[PDB]
Design a protein around this ligand. Sequence first.
Ligand code: CA
Ligand code: CA
Ligand code: CA
Ligand code: CA
Ligand code: CA
Ligand code: CA
Ligand code: CA
Ligand code: CA
Lengths: 173, 173
Amino acid sequence: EEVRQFRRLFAQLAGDDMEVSATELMNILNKVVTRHPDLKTDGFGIDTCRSMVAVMDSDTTGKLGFEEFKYLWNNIKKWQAIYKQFDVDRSGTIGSSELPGAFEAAGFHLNEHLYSMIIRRYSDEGGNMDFDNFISCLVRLDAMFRAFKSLDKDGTGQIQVNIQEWLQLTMYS
Amino acid sequence: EEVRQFRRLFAQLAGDDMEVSATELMNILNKVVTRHPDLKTDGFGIDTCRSMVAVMDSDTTGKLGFEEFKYLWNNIKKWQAIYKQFDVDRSGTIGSSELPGAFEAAGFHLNEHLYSMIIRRYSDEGGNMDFDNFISCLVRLDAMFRAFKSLDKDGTGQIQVNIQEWLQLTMYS
Ligand SMILES: [Ca+2]
Ligand SMILES: [Ca+2]
Ligand SMILES: [Ca+2]
Ligand SMILES: [Ca+2]
Ligand SMILES: [Ca+2]
Ligand SMILES: [Ca+2]
Ligand SMILES: [Ca+2]
Ligand SMILES: [Ca+2]
């Protein structure tokens, strides 16, 4: 029944081409946040959604098919739950001091240098990250872990990236 | 002469803290576009401006110093001229058949496969790319070429990276 209700909701979200475009994704993400007053956000903008589509578009059709959209949606749900749980002052945002505990609850255990870099690149002047920034960040972080893993065949902790693959991975994202 | 003019322009834009923030950049670019009606754009938004700054921020200050801003600004001017010239139909946007001409004038040679990915990420449903996306795409592309080159100084066409280095290189919105 859980499977059946979700299949139906994808069909309603994707429309006749049975894929979710960046614009489509934007409108449903914004409808979601409207329902959660505990999530502070300046909204999901079109370019952030284009990035999320690209990074999750493994079959390169330009849009999210059922399995791609399922994977992303279920990640957003789990990370939404985490954002709420680690926003302990109820600011609606993930502060610098909340961020490590949240990334780690999402299964991404980094280090001091890498957290600093994330806040520098993703958080605002006050070191705070709102909900669309946190989602955009994790979608990419998850993807980059998955891409390193796909490339690390022999399990050695070191990958070898050619220019073409570099370009593909960084630009279609 | 023109050298002291630009040094003073930087000083004026950077203001009190002597560096250019994502916000200051957003404000000067948006005022730039408003004085070229031939340059179609939905505007330079915070995500795009925070993301240009991040890729240009070589010294991890979170803001653009003189040399960083200069490199960025001079590229933007060069690319703006290319955009106007390669928009041969005067649609005010760079269409899929105009894009390879433009990128070649900018010094970039890419295979069809990578154009198709770039078009899907940065252009609309008709294949037409607006000015802020064009600039955002070129800034990223040049930055990725430079990051790769620095780690491949013998020109093998391949770099070798551990997970820490990989997140540092790729975690750019
Ligand atoms: Ca659709
Ligand atoms: Ca797809
Ligand atoms: Ca908080
Ligand atoms: Ca935001
Ligand atoms: Ca300043
Ligand atoms: Ca800097
Ligand atoms: Ca055109
Ligand atoms: Ca745009």
